[PDB]
Ligand binder design. Structure first.
Ligand SMILES: *[C@H](C)[C@H]1/C(=C/c2[nH]c(/C=C3N=C(/C=C4\NC(=O)C(CC)=C4C)C(C)=C\3CCC(=O)O)c(CCC(=O)O)c2C)NC(=O)[C@@H]1C
Ligand SMILES: *[C@H](C)[C@H]1/C(=C/c2[nH]c(/C=C3N=C(/C=C4\NC(=O)C(CC)=C4C)C(C)=C\3CCC(=O)O)c(CCC(=O)O)c2C)NC(=O)[C@@H]1C
Ligand SMILES: *[C@H](C)[C@H]1/C(=C/c2[nH]c(/C=C3N=C(/C=C4\NC(=O)C(CC)=C4C)C(C)=C\3CCC(=O)O)c(CCC(=O)O)c2C)NC(=O)[C@@H]1C
Ligand SMILES: *[C@H](C)[C@H]1/C(=C/c2[nH]c(/C=C3N=C(/C=C4\NC(=O)C(CC)=C4C)C(C)=C\3CCC(=O)O)c(CCC(=O)O)c2C)NC(=O)[C@@H]1C
Ligand SMILES: *[C@H](C)[C@H]1/C(=C/c2[nH]c(/C=C3N=C(/C=C4\NC(=O)C(CC)=C4C)C(C)=C\3CCC(=O)O)c(CCC(=O)O)c2C)NC(=O)[C@@H]1C
Ligand SMILES: *[C@H](C)[C@H]1/C(=C/c2[nH]c(/C=C3N=C(/C=C4\NC(=O)C(CC)=C4C)C(C)=C\3CCC(=O)O)c(CCC(=O)O)c2C)NC(=O)[C@@H]1C
Ligand SMILES: *[C@H](C)[C@H]1/C(=C/c2[nH]c(/C=C3N=C(/C=C4\NC(=O)C(CC)=C4C)C(C)=C\3CCC(=O)O)c(CCC(=O)O)c2C)NC(=O)[C@@H]1C
Ligand SMILES: *[C@H](C)[C@H]1/C(=C/c2[nH]c(/C=C3N=C(/C=C4\NC(=O)C(CC)=C4C)C(C)=C\3CCC(=O)O)c(CCC(=O)O)c2C)NC(=O)[C@@H]1C
Ligand SMILES: *[C@H](C)[C@H]1/C(=C/c2[nH]c(/C=C3N=C(/C=C4\NC(=O)C(CC)=C4C)C(C)=C\3CCC(=O)O)c(CCC(=O)O)c2C)NC(=O)[C@@H]1C
Ligand SMILES: *[C@H](C)[C@H]1/C(=C/c2[nH]c(/C=C3N=C(/C=C4\NC(=O)C(CC)=C4C)C(C)=C\3CCC(=O)O)c(CCC(=O)O)c2C)NC(=O)[C@@H]1C
Ligand SMILES: *[C@H](C)[C@H]1/C(=C/c2[nH]c(/C=C3N=C(/C=C4\NC(=O)C(CC)=C4C)C(C)=C\3CCC(=O)O)c(CCC(=O)O)c2C)NC(=O)[C@@H]1C
Lengths: 144, 161, 160, 64, 160, 160, 161, 160, 161, 161
């Protein structure tokens, strides 16, 4: 706690009580949140009470380094944490997860693109269940 | 993650605009495509084991990798590689249903290059495997689904490379 | 969205989507067109819904638009109406999504904290949303209204 | 500070275990008052049954 | 667990294949289901108020809240209303499930012992539960009320 | 069943059931009646399904009913058929539940270990289940068969 | 963390020197300022919620940030920003009592820039908010206290920028 | 419109509006709200008015819908009905305007020439308009009908 | 020319749409304003000579224009200028009754700039006179009528300039 | 960079496909639009200074930015901002002729966000200016050209956002 900013404090707590780094930004928010607005004693208490701790360490096992495959950056991030000696680097392994832009728009995808052509092209044609006299009178261009 | 419906919503929300007809049309387009996507997903799930088998046979196995001193040598490593292949397939299926490539970026693509480099896993071989899976998947899903399926596979491949 | 929710559950389980889950997705995509119409209706009536709800709220709570009250003054009253408009936009987004998640991220998380700094009373805000619901219900057809009601109710529950 | 002495039994429904794991199945433990609430819930969610609860330390209905 | 699963489990211990009589019970549940879903949504939206009303009916303006009473001090007051919330949430779960078992597994298990050590008064708690039931009955409406009542009564009997 | 699953997720989150979750419950209760019919069909045909599947299995695997083989002898052959009957009963339970969980707890956990002590070959057991599926599929209508197939497939996957 | 008294001690300890009159005078200087600081701290704690409100009103709200597409748009982001503001205030109060800027460096300042850059939070706006808080605080604390309070606020601002 | 007509007369005289002219404008603005309702009524009943009038016209003139006749055949009959619809729309425009000018520009100038090229008989078209008038009159209240009649009569007079 | 009622009709006619409630509302709006407009028009007609006199006094006369070598010097030119002023007033009154600016474009505005430039009449001074007439008219008509009257005067001014 | 013609060619070349009718149609579409684009470009070049002036008047000037403590305060900063505006205009014109957005990505869009953040230039204000330029440009170019011009302006705006 005492010589580290509150984010780095959540790192260390994850490392020490679950054996992992912080998996995602939602998790960073929940725990870092609770560390503000309550003690460090609350953070520690939440981890050990949570389900992850319960699933894997149970009541009688000492936690250990998880070395997780799974969420995504978790494996590389955890292993950077495990490799550092005490006081070797104080820097955040994960300051926070940077949010990602969109490479492709919805309309570029083939199935959508096709469905747009079908509605757009032949948007105006002949309507069934409409009496013909009403249909012949209907205007296509409308405004302009 | 994000899906096509949510993507439209999010774009409007940043503008602060209420949903408009043009936006509605994009949503409508997605809804029609949906039925096809669901059928494709079911096909992939049922044939997942085979898809992986075929793809491995095409690219991974009978190679230096499987021979001693190769990355896929030893049972442990072999099992890991096929587990990774399964991941890619599952996520691609999720993306196809979603209609958005974002989930791939958020879960699969993020940190993968770095992980692989530390592990010493060969990226090009992995990409080869993904491409192989794509080809097999294209056949099973059928033509309409194929084009949609292919884009997500290509997205994964481009990210890794 | 419904689909996002299904995918997320599958990913947690680390499994492909179940047939049952897939069926629910199919149902949702069919429902979507009806949902779009419901949303469209509210969008068109948006201006009037906000206006009517505002008036009802001010009648229900004289205090908010009183010299002591937060809403009092032109600037403040406009902001209160802007907030009502925001919540309506969120509700429309929810209906098309078929899930409260879109609504929830934009409007219901940290809402208490934001309003407490502003000093706006949370119960009054809830009343405004209730008022908007009643106006919206009248314009909507009964079955459409029920669908819309669920999203409105969620908002009221969130702001409590 | 108040403490709770709790005896609870939790069955291993998900998997058969080769390790003896007697301690995990049947445990008597001292719980801080604040922690117990959460712990009780967690035992319930596991499907374990709490046979006995007692307040080890402190006085019941004490204002301070 | 659930009404459906309860029937299954009873058959499984017998080793009997599912039979028409069993099927009829399952069918009965399926019809009731729709009503239950509507009731649950009502309760969730009005949960805060339900608790408030019930407290007003029994807990507050009482010796308990007065100094030397169990619910005296903010900490104790907050605890009691937290417990009230749990009873409501679990009863709602039970109503959807159609089975009392979840109440036994979650709420009822270890409660009596905890309360006795704490010196919380069981009869007053039961009174609060009964009050919640009455409030809930109104909101849910008559058909739903009968179903809702049984779970509330089950909780009350367990605590006593 | 589906409902149990929904309740359990809510309890973990310590929240009332979401509208989306509630909707899924509604869908399930509607589906249940159809599910009951599918289960009923298999129950009536149970005796024949087991008999036919047994014969197919023994043809597919002469070895199991051979002096070396586990199944050989009247007592042993009866036990093998009893096992097939057990799995069919589990499948019916699954169909009504709408989930594999009921099946899974009774039949799929520790199955490998049990059979290894018995020395029964696991692949042969899987073949028997596959055989039962084929018989069951024929009696069921196509859409019904697909639903039943999923549960049958799960069993085959579990015993692998 | 470190304070003024401990800072003097530490400087002497590395030298190995016993405390000397010059050192004593620095300590004496701190002791006189101390009483004022304690009064200021109590004022800030009582008015903390209002201080944040006023500062937000001055800079953050009624701005593009709060408008859709702005960093502080959405309730979640708004709440985060005011939480950050509270942090800065609490730590500045701690620093003022201590008479040393070190605690700010150890807790607040270290890694903040990097965090903000990943988040996309705008540093200049945050700095603006800190400066606004300083102005509000200055009023409440009164002039003698204000000078002392200002230096810590300025220290935070310089660190972020 | 009334106003356009008044302005035009004034401009020809190169004078400001006369008191008498101003009075007519005043009368028109008072009448307008009534006029709007009359127009609204016909718009709602438009589809039926056209249909009924068409039938009457065809009964009155068998020839038009005969192999020789212009109207004969489905395509042609639709066009004849479309024409009737056009004229009805024009009449509604006229009622709100309070003058035939809007009607006149769109429908009555060059009408003879257009129909002569088409070879449609002008008298039959007039009969159709008369028929529409009768249908419209029945739906309208008596005073309302008189107002509507004037516009209908003008059309008949214009094309004969 | 066009009027408000006809403008609505024409917009609907190009669409081919029957008149709808939204359209009806616009028409209804006009009908309420109508009574006020008629009263205003009568006021203007009665006071037209004075309006012109006052406006000329405000801008045109006692100026270089009226002095020798100015555009409005000589009786003939003076008379021409006041005749033009009358035209503008009459047409503005027509426009106000109509509720549409089109008549101004069709009669007054078309070719006026070019005519004035060839003549060497000063446009800015003319615009000044129009603005002066507006002010005088505003007084006589009264506030509700004035707003309506002002827009047409401004339209003329913008066209000339 | 690429232009529309080359973009089609490049897409085909990676596929290895000979040019096909569908591809030809895209090329044909471009060829018809071409003449209009050339005319639009000449209009923009001639009126570039004015376009910038008008857009600045609409958004940038008479604002807090120009007032002391604003980003565009001081002559040096003012000149920089109008230089940036000119860049956007020139590049958009290039893109319009090309018929491809790629040049914008390669030159303007790449690194702009980061540059602006370091500088402390406000992105939203810049976007506002771009949108203003678009409106002015739309008028001068005329309607057919405007649609084409608008997409490139919008592309720039979206990138900066
Ligand atoms: C022989 C008793 C059985 C048998 C063997 C069989 N294996 C393959 C192919 C491969 N088997 C391996 C196995 C290993 N790789 C390792 O690293 C280890 C541990 C050191 C082992 C044991 C691998 C990697 C392959 C893939 C080919 C390659 O090396 O690249 C086959 C043929 C593959 C196919 O199915 O086409 C076979 C036949 N098959 C039997 O049925 C026997 C019972
Ligand atoms: C078999 C001869 C009889 C039988 C056994 C049975 N045991 C359990 C469950 C458990 N048994 C133990 C016992 C031990 N754990 C240890 O560490 C040791 C010493 C090394 C022993 C002997 C425990 C702790 C359990 C709990 C589960 C676990 O995995 O630890 C069961 C399951 C009952 C249940 O419902 O959970 C059974 C069936 N019971 C019989 O019927 C046989 C006569
Ligand atoms: C006065 C500043 C504000 C106010 C007060 C108010 N309080 C109640 C009701 C209760 N207040 C308490 C408070 C306490 N009980 C405790 O044990 C402690 C800690 C020592 C406190 C402070 C309680 C328990 C009640 C419940 C009733 C009861 O005591 O039996 C009300 C009435 C609300 C109701 O519906 O009961 C009111 C009005 N109200 C304001 O708005 C003032 C700003
Ligand atoms: C309110 C209706 C009555 C009341 C309640 C009360 N409870 C406590 C303290 C606790 N109550 C519980 C109960 C539960 N824990 C669980 O996990 C569940 C199931 C979801 C229940 C119902 C527990 C564990 C505690 C201890 C710690 C905690 O806060 O959870 C108090 C405080 C007593 C004390 O001495 O601190 C009170 C007041 N008592 C009344 O006055 C009402 C009649
Ligand atoms: C038939 C497909 C194969 C086969 C079967 C076989 N089983 C046994 C003996 C037992 N089988 C079971 C199985 C179950 N008991 C359960 O509770 C469940 C879950 C509901 C199952 C599936 C058990 C426990 C026994 C023991 C006897 C008993 O339960 O009374 C035998 C006899 C062997 C023995 O030593 O008992 C046989 C032959 N054998 C094959 O090879 C077929 C492929
Ligand atoms: C109206 C029912 C009540 C009311 C409203 C009120 N609100 C404000 C000011 C703000 N409210 C918001 C709210 C939102 N911003 C978001 O991002 C979202 C979700 C999309 C919401 C709902 C914000 C951010 C502001 C700050 C203003 C700004 O944009 O800078 C006021 C004005 C008070 C003030 O000092 O600004 C008012 C009056 N007030 C009541 O008491 C009514 C019950
Ligand atoms: C308010 C002036 C500005 C603002 C802030 C803002 N911050 C976040 C998110 C985070 N803020 C922090 C910062 C800290 N954690 C620490 O340990 C310290 C040092 C004491 C600080 C200051 C952290 C770590 C987070 C992330 C996790 C969390 O939310 O708890 C946000 C939300 C960003 C998002 O995209 O979600 C915001 C908005 N933004 C503004 O607009 C102001 C300029
Ligand atoms: C004196 C015999 C009578 C009289 C004169 C009078 N004139 C004005 C104002 C103006 N007179 C003129 C006249 C001319 N401008 C020309 O270009 C020519 C021909 C070359 C003439 C005759 C003009 C232009 C004005 C307006 C002011 C100006 O010069 O710009 C007044 C003042 C009236 C007023 O209110 O403006 C008067 C009094 N009036 C009498 O009562 C005498 C009988
Ligand atoms: C008085 C405010 C200003 C003024 C007027 C002025 N006009 C002329 C001459 C002409 N003005 C017109 C204008 C029109 N002709 C049209 O057809 C229309 C629209 C339908 C207009 C409004 C024309 C054509 C002439 C020439 C012939 C004629 O006057 O009949 C003059 C005299 C110019 C001359 O040398 O004859 C004057 C003074 N000029 C000003 O300086 C005042 C600001
Ligand atoms: C006066 C001697 C001459 C004159 C001045 C004039 N200036 C403007 C508008 C602006 N002038 C500035 C200049 C500065 N901003 C700075 O930061 C500095 C250096 C400290 C300077 C000198 C700016 C930015 C503007 C734009 C408006 C704004 O501040 O927001 C005008 C208005 C014209 C316009 O198009 O805006 C004028 C008239 N012009 C003359 O004709 C005088 C001889
Ligand atoms: C104008 C609308 C806004 C504005 C602009 C502004 N820009 C700078 C400085 C720079 N701008 C650029 C940008 C570019 N260089 C490129 O190559 C490209 C793409 C072709 C762009 C868009 C660069 C690199 C600089 C830095 C170097 C330079 O000034 O030439 C400033 C100066 C900022 C400073 O601190 O010096 C300004 C003011 N200012 C606003 O606020 C407007 C919203």
């Amino acid at each position: 706690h005492d010589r580290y900013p509150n984010t780095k404090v959540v790192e260390f707590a994850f490392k020490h009580f679950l054996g992992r780094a912080v998996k995602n930004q939602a998790e960073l928010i929940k725990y870092h949140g609770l560390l503000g607005r309550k003690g460090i004693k609350a953070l520690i208490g939440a981890l050990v009470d949570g389900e992850e701790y319960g699933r894997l360490y149970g009541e009688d096992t000492v936690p250990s380094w998880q070395f997780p495959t799974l969420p995504a950056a978790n494996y590389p991030n955890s292993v950077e944490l495990y490799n550092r000696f005490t006081r070797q680097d104080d820097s955040l392994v994960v300051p926070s997860f940077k949010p990602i832009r969109s490479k492709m728009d919805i309309a570029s995808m083939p199935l959508v693109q096709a469905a747009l052509k079908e509605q757009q092209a032949t948007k105006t044609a002949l309507d069934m269940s409409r009496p013909m006299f009403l249909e012949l009178g209907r205007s296509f261009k409308g405004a302009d | 993650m994000q899906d096509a419906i949510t993507a439209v919503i999010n774009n409007y929300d940043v503008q602060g605009k209420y949903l408009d007809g043009a936006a509605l049309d994009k949503l409508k387009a997605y809804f029609t495509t949906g039925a096809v996507r669901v059928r494709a997903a079911a096909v992939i799930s049922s044939n997942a084991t085979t898809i992986i088998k075929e793809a491995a046979a095409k690219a991974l196995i009978y190679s230096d990798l499987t021979r001693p001193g190769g990355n896929m040598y030893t049972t442990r490593r072999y099992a890991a590689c096929i587990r990774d292949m399964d991941y890619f397939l599952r996520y691609a299926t999720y993306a196809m249903l979603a209609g958005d490539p974002s989930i791939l970026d958020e879960r699969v693509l993020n940190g993968l290059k770095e992980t692989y480099n530390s592990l010493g896993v060969p990226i090009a071989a992995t990409v080869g495997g993904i491409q192989a899976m794509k080809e097999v998947v294209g056949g099973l899903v059928g033509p309409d689904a194929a084009k949609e399926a292919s884009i997500y596979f290509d997205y994964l491949s481009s990210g890794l490379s | 969205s419904v689909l996002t929710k299904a995918i997320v559950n599958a990913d947690a389980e680390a499994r492909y989507l179940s047939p049952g889950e897939l069926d629910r997705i199919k149902s949702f995509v069919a429902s979507g067109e009806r949902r779009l119409r419901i949303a469209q209706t509210l969008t068109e009536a948006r201006e009037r819904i906000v206006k009517q709800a505002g008036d009802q709220l001010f009648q229900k709570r004289p205090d908010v638009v009183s010299p002591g009250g937060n809403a009092y003054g032109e600037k403040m009253t406009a902001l209160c109406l802007r907030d009502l408009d925001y919540y309506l936009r969120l509700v429309t987004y929810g209906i098309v999504a078929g899930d409260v998640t879109p609504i929830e991220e934009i409007g219901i998380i940290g809402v208490k904290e934001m309003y407490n700094s502003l000093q706006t009373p949370i119960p009054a805000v809830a009343e405004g949303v209730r008022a908007m619901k009643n106006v919206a219900t009248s314009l909507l057809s009964g079955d459409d209204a029920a669908e819309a009601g669920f999203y409105f109710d969620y908002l009221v529950g969130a702001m409590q | 500070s108040r403490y709770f002495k709790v005896t609870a039994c939790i069955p291993s429904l998900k998997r058969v275990r080769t390790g003896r794991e007697l301690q995990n199945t049947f445990f008597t433990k001292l719980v801080p008052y604040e922690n117990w609430f959460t712990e009780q819930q967690r035992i319930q969610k596991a499907g374990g049954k709490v046979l006995s609860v007692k307040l080890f330390t402190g006085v019941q209905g004490a204002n301070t």
